[PDB]
Design a protein around this nucleic acid. Structure first.
Lengths: 141, 97, 48, 376
RNA sequence: AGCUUUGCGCAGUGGCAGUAUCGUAGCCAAUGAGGUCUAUCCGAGGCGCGAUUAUUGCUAAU
């Protein structure tokens, strides 16, 4: 959580989206003190080095940057948004919402899976990519 | 080892964890053997049957290697038993430790 | 009774709790190990 | 009988050495000091050359009562002590305290189990005036060996200053006495100096690695034992090499102040703390980026063989086809859902059986086949 | 005069293997690398890192 780079004001996050062309910008909007946000801000730690080639991770505190709450619906405790060449890459999950991952997960392989899928679908020039796993359930049984 | 131990009757019939009889047929034979006794279901005098079903707890872990070698040298020559007990003594390796 | 050839006993059969729990756990680990397995693979494991 | 009379001259020589060493405790408070070390080393060599024959006599005489114990207790002095303690009747092995001071508990239990199944017969009283006499003189010779051991250990601060500092005077004495003298071991390669006093310990139904194999006094020295068990062998080789480097110096009596010994110790410690140094910083390389559209590739005999290995063999491609509306008996009971499809099926396919291919034959690696060659 | 042995070069023909080749102004190493059999014997390289389509080029299509 605290290890990943942080953005303090509204201009910085827009620049971070704009200051990159050949990777994917994975922004974790939320509160790093949240139990939910801290659950996945360590998954994003454990893979930050691995996905350096095609992904950069910035963290944003919505209280510190109250400029994207209304436009991108920042009201779930934790949100993940993928951007490619200044274009929000929609991703189709099993959940109804197809613009964000509003839940914190647990496995360090699936997040790299999703990031690499987003990169693969963004090099082609798509706007909506399809995740490999289905999140209409939790596969618990 | 198994071929020789079958050619020469090493294991007695009562030791059949897995014999030519499949486990269900083992159950059937065991029940029929209980029934086939002379007066198994008779209690006029006041006699009684009792039946114990247990397992040697931690039998595998509590096998001392040297004692196992001594027992094994009885049935097989010394070299093969020594090979067995040396093979048992070996480094176990997980992902890291 | 082999000596007399008469129905003298009665063996009621049942599946113990250990076997039922083992089968349920087997079905559970079939179901949870279905991240990408085809439907045919899952059903083949189930039938087996 | 003959051995006891033979040791009489050795006993007189040992008494003379005892008188000299007692005087050495007074003279050090024309017959120089070094000769009192050289003749003492010769005397301890002779008492060992008598201990071996008396141990052989004990084994020969006691094989009538218990013919298997020598194969279970390899060490000589251990054998003498064990035959002295057990006696003719072997019922003195259960919860016996003095057996424990000689034998490992595992070998205690193996010799007890063997004592249960003994084909040997009891010995007469005549056998008990020979074996016990031999055991008593064996313990006396061991006491003499230790009583000259302490003296040699004390005097290697002077006789071999370079060798006595790398390993310590105690193990220095243990490796110079058994080698036949400093001159003898100076002619000895370091590989052989490793195996000085290397007991051929009888593995008690264990892996040969568990009971240190090919281990000598140098492997039991204080310097090597300070290291973790994995590095000890690698440390044993190096320490024995520097030990013989110092031994060749001490044989001709150079660097008596220990300059070469200190240099060798410095080299040993440098190698040791280089081995124990923590691993360096290793960068975690990132995963490769997802690939682009197309890339040019080469093609030839290598690509042809790759296409042959990974190509769809006709038996493989025939198995993928799975017919239609044709129930078949479930082959491979242990795992159903494994149907061969048209392979061996009356639905369709070739009249002749699909012949097996040879390109798909399993093959072993080059390095693994190299291991096979060396192992055989 | 030929015959012939061995090493190192230049080419030629052919076979074989691509879970392997290669680097070492990194370290250690016959003053011993490394040791499972057989150890008073054995006895040459090993380790760590980097390159990689498990050596590397062109030509050739798409």
């Amino acid at each position: 959580s605290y290890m990943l780079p942080h953005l303090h004001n509204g201009w910085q996050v827009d620049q971070a989206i704009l200051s990159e062309e050949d990777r994917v910008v994975v922004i974790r909007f939320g509160h790093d003190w949240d139990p939910t946000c801290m659950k996945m801000d360590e998954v994003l730690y454990s893979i930050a080095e691995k996905v350096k080639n095609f992904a950069v991770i910035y963290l944003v505190d919505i209280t510190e940057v109250p400029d994207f709450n209304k436009m991108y619906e920042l009201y779930d405790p934790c949100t993940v948004m993928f951007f490619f060449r200044n274009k929000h890459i929609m991703i189709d999950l099993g959940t109804g919402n197809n613009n964000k991952i509003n839940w914190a997960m647990e496995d360090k392989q699936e997040m790299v899976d999703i990031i690499e899928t987003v990169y693969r679908g963004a090099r082609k020039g798509r706007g909506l990519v399809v995740s490999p796993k289905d999140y209409s359930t939790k596969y618990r049984y | 080892l198994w071929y020789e131990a079958d050619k020469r009757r090493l294991f007695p019939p009562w030791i059949k964890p897995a014999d030519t009889e499949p486990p269900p047929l083992l159950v059937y034979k065991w029940c029929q053997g209980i029934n086939n006794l002379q007066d198994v279901w008779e209690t006029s005098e006041g006699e009684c049957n009792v039946m114990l079903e247990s397992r040697f707890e931690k039998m595998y872990e509590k096998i001392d290697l040297t004692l196992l070698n001594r027992l094994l040298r009885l049935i097989v020559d010394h070299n093969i038993a020594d090979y067995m007990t040396a093979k048992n003594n070996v480094v176990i390796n997980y992902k890291d430790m | 009774n082999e000596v007399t050839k008469e129905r003298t006993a009665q063996c009621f059969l049942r599946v113990d709790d250990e076997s039922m729990q083992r089968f349920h756990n087997r079905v559970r680990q079939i179901l949870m190990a279905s991240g990408s397995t085809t439907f045919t693979k899952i059903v083949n494991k189930w039938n087996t | 009988a003959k051995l006891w009379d033979s040791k009489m001259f050795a006993e007189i020589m040992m008494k003379i050495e005892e008188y000299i060493s007692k005087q050495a405790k007074a003279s050090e408070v024309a017959a120089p000091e070094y000769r009192v070390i050289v003749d003492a080393n010769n005397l301890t060599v002779e008492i060992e050359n008598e201990l071996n024959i008396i141990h052989k006599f004990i084994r020969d005489k006691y094989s009538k009562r218990f013919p298997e114990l020598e194969s279970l207790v390899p060490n000589a002095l251990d054998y003498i002590r064990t035959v002295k303690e057990l006696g003719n009747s072997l019922d003195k092995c259960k919860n016996n305290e003095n057996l424990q001071q000689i034998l490992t508990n595992a070998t205690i239990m193996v010799v007890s189990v063997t004592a249960s199944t003994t084909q040997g017969q009891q010995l007469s009283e005549e056998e008990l005036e020979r074996l016990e006499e031999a055991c008593d003189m064996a313990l006396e010779l061991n006491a003499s060996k230790h009583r000259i051991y302490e003296y040699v250990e004390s005097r290697m601060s002077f006789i071999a200053p370079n060798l006595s500092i790398i390993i310590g005077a105690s193990t220095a004495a243990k490796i110079m006495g058994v080698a036949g003298g400093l001159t003898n071991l100076s002619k000895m390669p370091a590989c052989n100096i490793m195996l000085l006093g290397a007991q051929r310990k009888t593995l008690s139904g264990f892996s040969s690695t568990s009971v240190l194999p090919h281990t000598g006094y140098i492997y039991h020295s204080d310097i090597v034992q300070s290291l973790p068990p994995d590095l000890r062998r690698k440390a044993a080789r190096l320490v024995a090499a520097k030990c013989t480097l110092a031994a060749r110096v001490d044989s001709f009596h150079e660097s008596t102040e220990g300059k070469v010994g200190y240099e060798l110790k410095d080299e040993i410690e440098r190698k040791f703390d280089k081995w124990q140094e923590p691993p360096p910083v290793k960068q975690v390389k990132p995963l490769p980026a997802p690939l682009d559209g197309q890339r040019k590739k080469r093609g030839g005999r290598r690509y042809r063989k790759m296409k042959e290995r990974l190509g769809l063999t006709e038996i493989r491609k025939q198995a993928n086809r799975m017919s239609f509306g044709e129930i078949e008996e479930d082959a491979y009971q242990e795992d159903l859902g494994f149907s061969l499809g048209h392979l061996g099926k009356s639905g369709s396919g070739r009249v002749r059986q699909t012949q097996v291919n040879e390109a798909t034959k399993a093959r072993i690696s080059k390095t693994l086949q190299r291991t096979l060659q060396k192992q055989s």
